[PDB]
Amino acid sequence: VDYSGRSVITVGPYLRLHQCGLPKKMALELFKPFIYGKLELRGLATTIK
Amino acid sequence: EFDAIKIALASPDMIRSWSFGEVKKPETINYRTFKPERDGLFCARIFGPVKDYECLCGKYKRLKHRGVICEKCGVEVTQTKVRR
Amino acid sequence: DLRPLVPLDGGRFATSDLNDLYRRVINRNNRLKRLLDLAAPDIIVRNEK
Amino acid sequence: EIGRTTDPVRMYMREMGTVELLTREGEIDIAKRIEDGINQVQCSVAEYPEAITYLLEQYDRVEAEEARLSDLITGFVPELAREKFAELRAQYVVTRDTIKATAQEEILKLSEVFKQFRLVPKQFDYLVNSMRVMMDRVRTQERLIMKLCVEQCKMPKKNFITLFTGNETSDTWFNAAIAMNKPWSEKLHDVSEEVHRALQKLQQIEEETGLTIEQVKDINRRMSIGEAKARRAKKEMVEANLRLVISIAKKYTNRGLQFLDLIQEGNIGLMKAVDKFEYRRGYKFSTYATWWIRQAITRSIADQARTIRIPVHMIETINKLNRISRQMLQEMGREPTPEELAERMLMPEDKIRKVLKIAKEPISMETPIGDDEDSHLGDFIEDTTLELPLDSATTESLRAATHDVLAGLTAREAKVLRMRFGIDMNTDYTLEEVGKQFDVTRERIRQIEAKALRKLRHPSRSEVLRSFLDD
Amino acid sequence: TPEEKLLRAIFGEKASDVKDSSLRVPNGVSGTVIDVQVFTRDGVEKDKRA
Numbered sequence: 228v229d230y231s232g233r234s235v236i237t238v239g240p241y242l243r244l245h246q247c248g249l250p251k252k253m254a255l256e257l258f259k260p261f262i263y264g265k266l267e268l269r270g271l272a273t274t275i276k
Numbered sequence: 277e278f279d280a281i282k283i284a285l286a287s288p289d290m291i292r293s294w295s296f297g298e299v300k301k302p303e304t305i306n307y308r309t310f311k312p313e314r315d316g317l318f319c320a321r322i323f324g325p326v327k328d329y330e331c332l333c334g335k336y337k338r339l340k341h342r343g344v345i346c347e348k349c350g351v352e353v354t355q356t357k358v359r360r
Numbered sequence: 361d362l363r364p365l366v367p368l369d370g371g372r373f374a375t376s377d378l379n380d381l382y383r384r385v386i387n388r389n390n391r392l393k394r395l396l397d398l399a400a401p402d403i404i405v406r407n408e409k
Numbered sequence: 410e411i412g413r414t415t416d417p418v419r420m421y422m423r424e425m426g427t428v429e430l431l432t433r434e435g436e437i438d439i440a441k442r443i444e445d446g447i448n449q450v451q452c453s454v455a456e457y458p459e460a461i462t463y464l465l466e467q468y469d470r471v472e473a474e475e476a477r478l479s480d481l482i483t484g485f486v487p488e489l490a491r492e493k494f495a496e497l498r499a500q501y502v503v504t505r506d507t508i509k510a511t512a513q514e515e516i517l518k519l520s521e522v523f524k525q526f527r528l529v530p531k532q533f534d535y536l537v538n539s540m541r542v543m544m545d546r547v548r549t550q551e552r553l554i555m556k557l558c559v560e561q562c563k564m565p566k567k568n569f570i571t572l573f574t575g576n577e578t579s580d581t582w583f584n585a586a587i588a589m590n591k592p593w594s595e596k597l598h599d600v601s602e603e604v605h606r607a608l609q610k611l612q613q614i615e616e617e618t619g620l621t622i623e624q625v626k627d628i629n630r631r632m633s634i635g636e637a638k639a640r641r642a643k644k645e646m647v648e649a650n651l652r653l654v655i656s657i658a659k660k661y662t663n664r665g666l667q668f669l670d671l672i673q674e675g676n677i678g679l680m681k682a683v684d685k686f687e688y689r690r691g692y693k694f695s696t697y698a699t700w701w702i703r704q705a706i707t708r709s710i711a712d713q714a715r716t717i718r719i720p721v722h723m724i725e726t727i728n729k730l731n732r733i734s735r736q737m738l739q740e741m742g743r744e745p746t747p748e749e750l751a752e753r754m755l756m757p758e759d760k761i762r763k764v765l766k767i768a769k770e771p772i773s774m775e776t777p778i779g780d781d782e783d784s785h786l787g788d789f790i791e792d793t794t795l796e797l798p799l800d801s802a803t804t805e806s807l808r809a810a811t812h813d814v815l816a817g818l819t820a821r822e823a824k825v826l827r828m829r830f831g832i833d834m835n836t837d838y839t840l841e842e843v844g845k846q847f848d849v850t851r852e853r854i855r856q857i858e859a860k861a862l863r864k865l866r867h868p869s870r871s872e873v874l875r876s877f878l879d880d
Numbered sequence: 881t882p883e884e885k886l887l888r889a890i891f892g893e894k895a896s897d898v899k900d901s902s903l904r905v906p907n908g909v910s911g912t913v914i915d916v917q918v919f920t921r922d923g924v925e926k927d928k929r930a
């Protein structure tokens with residue numbers, strides 16, 4: 228499957244149980260189509276490249 | 277699109293219906309200039325072209341000629357996923 | 361392209377196994393056509409079939 | 410003892426073991442049988458005039474720059490040869506001029522001086538093929554005039570074969586068949602007009618052959634007898650020597666070609682040999698068949714053992730490299746380097762680099778690799794003809810950008826530029842093509858295209874187009 | 881493709897003759913290159929660093 232990854236899990240008890248602490252780097256890797264669309268939507272990046 | 281899968285035995289006439297040409301020889305490729313060696317198991321004539329929209333003899337190399345079987349080596353210039 | 365002879369990097373080819381099985385079937389097929397062209401003895405065409 | 414086994418090798422070994430070997434005098438007997446068959450078929454060919462006519466025509470063809478003499482005839486048992494051709498012409502024309510009697514004996518003498526004439530395999534086999542085809546065309550009218558009468562006319566084979574055989578050409582079995590006043594008498598009339606033209610084409614064939622029906626049938630029936638006897642002898646001897654083939658085929662055991670492939674291609678070579686064994690020279694058979702069986706097995710292994718077939722000469726070169734490398738390794742102590750093979754062989758040392766580079770067998774794409782839930786190699790070979798979706802997205806984006814840009818130009822200039830480049834149309838037209846469609850000379854359209862391009866360079870414009878250059 | 885011939889002609893660029901196939905440090909990883917080694921096949925002219 229695309230859009231998927233895995234890494235070690237750990238505790239994080241500050242969480243409310245509708246959320247999971249998910250790392251910045253995996254999240255920026257998994258959400259690149261969304262980020263590209265958002266950047267060229269807000270105009271911070273002229274083309275997709 | 278569709279709504280059911282039928283399964284039955286394949287006849288000689290059906291098996292010649294799916295197919296695009298007999299595979300006569302066992303050659304796969306040309307070991308020096310790795311072309312699909314006609315007309316063996318990877319035959320550009322039979323199973324399609326090797327790169328999109330390019331004949332095998334190099335004569336036709338553009339989408340201007342989509343669909344034209346070459347004269348020289350007879351490879352229908354079409355998308356190479358027809359190879360599949 | 362469902363039984364490919366893709367060249368893995370290094371000049372080495374990486375064929376499938378169906379290329380072997382078809383190559384063998386077609387060799388024995390062509391040989392049987394020949395053994396019927398030479399009007400061969402019976403035991404040889406029986407062995408070939 | 411039939412079943413109880415699913416091996417094909419055993420099923421071949423048994424069937425070849427039932428037959429027993431040959432004695433040397435036994436092989437001589439079989440060879441004499443083969444000569445008897447071949448001489449019978451050559452004599453049957455000799456009693457056929459067109460057997461001489463075809464050779465005469467072919468010699469002229471070789472005279473007329475259409476073939477070669479060496480590959481028109483296999484010599485004779487070329488000045489002697491050619492005077493023999495002219496003597497053939499003379500005796501042929503004299504037998505043709507003596508149609509009146511002794512012409513039986515003249516045809517005999519013509520064909521017997523022809524028997525000293527040795528032909529190409531194509532020559533004699535094609536003569537036999539022509540005679541087969543002529544007999545087939547005769548049997549065509551035969552099966553017509555038989556099936557029109559006993560099947561359609563309800564004529565007994567007693568009163569049909571009794572008279573249908575014996576004339577076959579005139580009406581004495583035809584008008585007098587109905588003149589016997591039989592239940593099939595009035596029933597032949599519907600087909601007697603068709604059977605008559607069937608006999609018309611039969612008479613045509615008799616005119617074409619130069620001989621009758623019955624005599625031609627005696628000839629080619631003796632011919633087929635001789636050929637069947639020759640085939641019987643050759644079957645006998647090859648069944649004798651299947652063991653020899655297994656013996657020679659054991660040794661090429663694992664060079665990439667299965668065992669029964671080796672024994673079968675050995676047998677095909679063996680048939681090649683038996684078609685050419687010559688006992689007059691007097692050498693034992695096995696000594697002569699061994700060359701052909703090794704040649705067949707090795708040509709086989711070279712031609713159909715690689716998945717990516719490499720020609721015969723190249724495999725001989727590779728076997729030369731490997732054999733000299735084995736020697737250099739036993740001698741030099743260690744493994745020789747790809748320049749020293751240049752010195753021990755006669756190679757430019759780059760030809761050997763290419764010959765070593767000729768790739769080995771493809772790793773079967775189901776090789777097991779450890780590991781991680783039993784995954785084979787085929788899981789690891791990515792797809793290269795794909796295009797990653799960012800480039801597909803960016804092609805779309807550039808399509809949209811160039812559309813919105815070219816909208817900025819004038820309509821005629823936008824069309825000349827959508828036509829000069831292949832934008833949004835099937836083909837990219839020459840400037841003369843676009844000129845003829847717009848009715849203008851090439852230079853004007855060239856200036857127009859340059860004007861549009863220059864305008865598109867213009868900053869305050871083409872900012873995004875510049876953005877589509879990533880480096 | 882069309883629109884690419886257009887772009888290239890508009891911006892006077894000559895398309896590249898040769899393809900980038902460099903070796904690059906894998907994503908995420910830092911390091912201090914502690915050793916390089918060049919293996920030149922026999923008969924190929926050793927460059928500066930070899």
Ligand SMILES: [Zn+2]
Pocket residue numbers: 331332333334335336346347348349350351
């Ligand atoms: Zn072509």
